[PDB]
Symmetry: C5
Subunit: 273 residues, 5 copies
């Protein structure tokens, strides 16, 4: 069985197969994923007018991200259940290639929406001081694109070519560090000249941003985080990867969006919190 440049889920699925718990959990966690996004979509739309006009674009961009994430997670939930099929004789789910191989790369290309928009949207809530809007945006968008595309290439090789996997991963990481750098600046400048309450929220946003975004390279590496023939190169690793993605997705998109919305309220000349 030649699988070629395929994600490790397919190798586990083709050799050991997945227990009921492994298969069902992965299905459940993806389903939770897309449900959260569609619920989030509704939240961000329905709350648009709770903030001053100038902040409303941030709600709108949250909604945009929710649409992307919903569509993707929904599709990926279907891809999961179509790619692995129950074998009665042993009572595990094995790779069903008629469903296509499972690939995480669906996520990556949709990040070309999510990442640019998430980075962009904070610039509609905070005011920069020493940094130029166009410059920050351009840096975010360039390094975002490069981070994603290089990672995208990498992940095709996570089994077939560990070297390519790691090198592309490393290149990607460089762009990630750039983004972290800029976003920290943005947070800091955003704090200048706003209420202590706003400043607390931006502190939280920074922590959330840092942890949630770091989860994504975590998910990248997941199968190998316990080394060769490790605990995680297994159905347990498959579960862990999709769990981490889901936590990251909800944190980086919804909760981030909720915090920005709350910031917008504190900054809003009519409204309270």
């Amino acid at each position: 069985q030649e699988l070629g440049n395929a994600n490790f889920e397919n190798f586990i699925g083709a050799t050991e197969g997945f227990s009921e718990i492994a298969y069902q959990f992965t299905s459940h966690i993806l389903t939770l994923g897309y449900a959260v996004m569609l619920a989030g979509l509704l939240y961000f739309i329905l709350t648009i007018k709770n903030v001053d006009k100038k902040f409303q674009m941030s709600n709108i961009l949250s909604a945009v991200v929710m649409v992307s994430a919903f569509l993707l997670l929904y599709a990926q939930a279907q891809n999961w259940t179509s790619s692995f099929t129950f074998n009665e004789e042993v009572g595990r789910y094995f790779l069903d290639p008629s469903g296509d191989l499972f690939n995480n790369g669906y996520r990556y290309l949709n990040w070309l929406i999510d990442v640019p928009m998430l980075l962009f949207q904070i610039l509609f809530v905070v005011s920069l001081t020493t940094s130029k809007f166009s410059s920050v945006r351009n840096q975010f968008w360039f390094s975002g694109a490069m981070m994603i595309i290089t990672g995208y290439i990498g992940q095709f090789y996570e089994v077939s070519n560990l070297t390519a996997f790691l090198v592309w991963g490393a290149i990607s990481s460089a762009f990630f560090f750039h983004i972290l750098w800029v976003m920290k600046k943005v947070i800091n400048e955003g704090k200048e000249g706003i209420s202590p309450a706003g400043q607390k929220i931006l502190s939280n946003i920074w922590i959330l941003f840092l942890i949630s975004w770091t989860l994504y390279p975590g998910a990248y590496l997941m199968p190998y985080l316990t080394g060769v023939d490790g605990f995680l190169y297994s159905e347990d690793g498959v579960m862990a990867r999709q769990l981490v993605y889901t936590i990251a997705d909800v944190s980086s998109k919804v909760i981030y969006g909720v915090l920005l919305f709350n910031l917008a309220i504190t900054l809003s000349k009519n409204k309270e919190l």
Copy 2:
């Protein structure tokens, strides 16, 4: 055959199979389920402006819950019909593993939306007295999460390991009791300083809450509530479980939301019901 850590529906389905009535009813009750949620979504959106601005977040969170519940019940309705297939020779529906095993765990993980949001939303209608908002919220959310996750683990074992089933169930129950405790506090404080009409509604809410939420552990235990080889360890138990879920879902989500909305109206300074 070998089903492993699978819900009892699959064992009934694999051995006895389901009569027309059992199979069709389970399909119908799930279909009613998701229909109610989508109708509820419409209701909560369309009525948002019937209450004072400060109460509207409760409508919004109702809507959020409706999205979650709709998506899940819709998915689960499809999962039911795909998991069991008519055998012409004997005229019953038997486990069709090409459709995946049926698993109730889909519900559980989606509760990570429903439970936090349902508990949260009342804090947007009632005013606390002695209790701190942040504290109540955090207790709800922590104990909610633990209740769900421990139950989730438990239900995989409802056939394969009755001991694990019951122990995880018991741990889960502890967190449930905590939630009941806090919600009682909240309802009592909520009654302080509002009209008798509001107070009557909150009394109803408490009864609704207590009964509807208790149904969920009822559904957990359902196959064994008539003991080993009891009436309910059967297609009749399968029917009963999904009926109870649906009653619980409608009560805990829709009717609860409607009562909160009615409370918000009585508390609403210009508006009247």
Copy 3:
């Protein structure tokens, strides 16, 4: 064949099969059904503000019913086409049990939305005189539920046990008569002390209500309305049943809703008919 407690569509489908016209028409009429409901949903939402605030809940409940009816008829349209499959050799559509048996009971359980809400919504347009709101509501909802549940049980037996069919049907009919009784009271009290225009509409509503609701037991009995081995125990009866349902659905839900909307306009202190 062994079909058990199944609707007569399946027996016709398994023995004679369905001609092109019979199969296609049933598909078409169900498709019209769900299209009407979704179109109606749009109508009721878009017109909400054409009436005084106090009447708007009736539009909202119309919309709620439209959601239910859309979802159900859509599902049932799919169920029809999946349950019967073309046989090349004889050129008719025969029961395809891989699609599940066809069952009308999907409708029945969804009536647990439709019936309570349709009965409820008039109480937001008319003013009662001697009758109490909560009392009428409770009678509607109780007798509605019992009508539905008893009929639901009955229809499983329409072939397998004519006796049970007829007895449950009869019990159901009793609750139906109660509803007719109460609704007549409501109409009469509603007419008291309102414009001639209002009174004309309520007269129409009563006729519509009486005819359209009676169609539903008509559909129940349809296969046997021409007796044993009658014209209607046939593909022609199958066609007739679904036609009657569709006429009933459009009449009892959409047209009813439209009349109530028109009543609300005449009663509306801001707007002109």
Copy 4:
């Protein structure tokens, strides 16, 4: 192959089959169809407030028709691709009866929405001078229904019974002529007492109405418009039929709706084209 009372598409499909171009084009044109309708839906909703309150019902009815047409064309696009399947050996698409026979009758019954509403909606934009509103409406609706139902019966016989085909067609045509008659009256009265610009639009509407509505009987006859065993009794005729439907659908529904909207704007007593 016994096909019975089936549309000619199925006979072509079962004997000669469809070339890539024929099969793909039919798929594409139906897809364009439903896309136009859903886009139209958005347009008519978003523009409602661009006209005076009294004209807005026309936008709403446009939207209603868009919902019907969207649902139907969407369904029919799926029916097309399910009904004909590629044969590798000769490289044409042949009747796949597991998908059901293809039938145009889906359209006809949905016209029970489209036709009444399209005829109705003009009466919310123009003022009649001689004719009573209710009278015109009733004539439209009666003759519309009879036109549709008689045509619906006819088209089942387009291959199996040319006589029935033509007789029912002729009866249908009589009702069509009545409608043309009434609509001409309506357009003439509508021109009376409005600006020359309004009058020009109604002139256009009449031409559009006359041509677009006549296309539908054109599509009815299409296979036989080149006589027995003519050019059009072929994959080319199949293509032509669905092309004509799509042109008719877009013209009679969307463009008609757009012209009526433009009329409503000219008549609107503080709006400007």
Copy 5:
């Protein structure tokens, strides 16, 4: 294998098949495509009131285009995955004709919405000087239609008849050049009498328009841009085609729409970038 007048994707797919990366990427890029359009839809709707009433029609037409593009790209994403199926033995995806042949012509016919509306919508933001609105519109729409239809015919022959391919392509190109000509006129007239900021945006719009629209004939020719038996007559060419379409789709529809929206803001008598 006999494929007839089919796109080259099917020939590659039937002979060499597609590697994991080629197949997955094409799936991913189409999925990104439709996600962007639905996100765009939401953006354009939610921002309508950020501009003066007179400009809002442009947002609405953007939304219209988004609906078309979403539906089409969604359908086409499904068509891709249905048309090519994994072969376990060699580990590539090969033509699965039970899914239908893949055809790019789906896009072309939907352009009958996109192209007319995209060209139209600018006329609601810029003011012409010496050119007449009706005249520009008619030129756009006529040449648009002819460009599309001739290209549509051409692309069926891209393998089966290179001569027809190139001739129809050339005719199509003539109409394209006409459109470029008119759009340049429109841009120039649009610049007259607006701020330098507006003029900068229109400069950008013209560049965007020119590049993005030219990509479409690029995609047309793609398999042959490296000549006979070139690099691009391959899975790499298949990937390239759909990438170019997606870039073109996002650029010509979303980014174009965003630029027009930004222009409308600068021109708007209340608001400012």
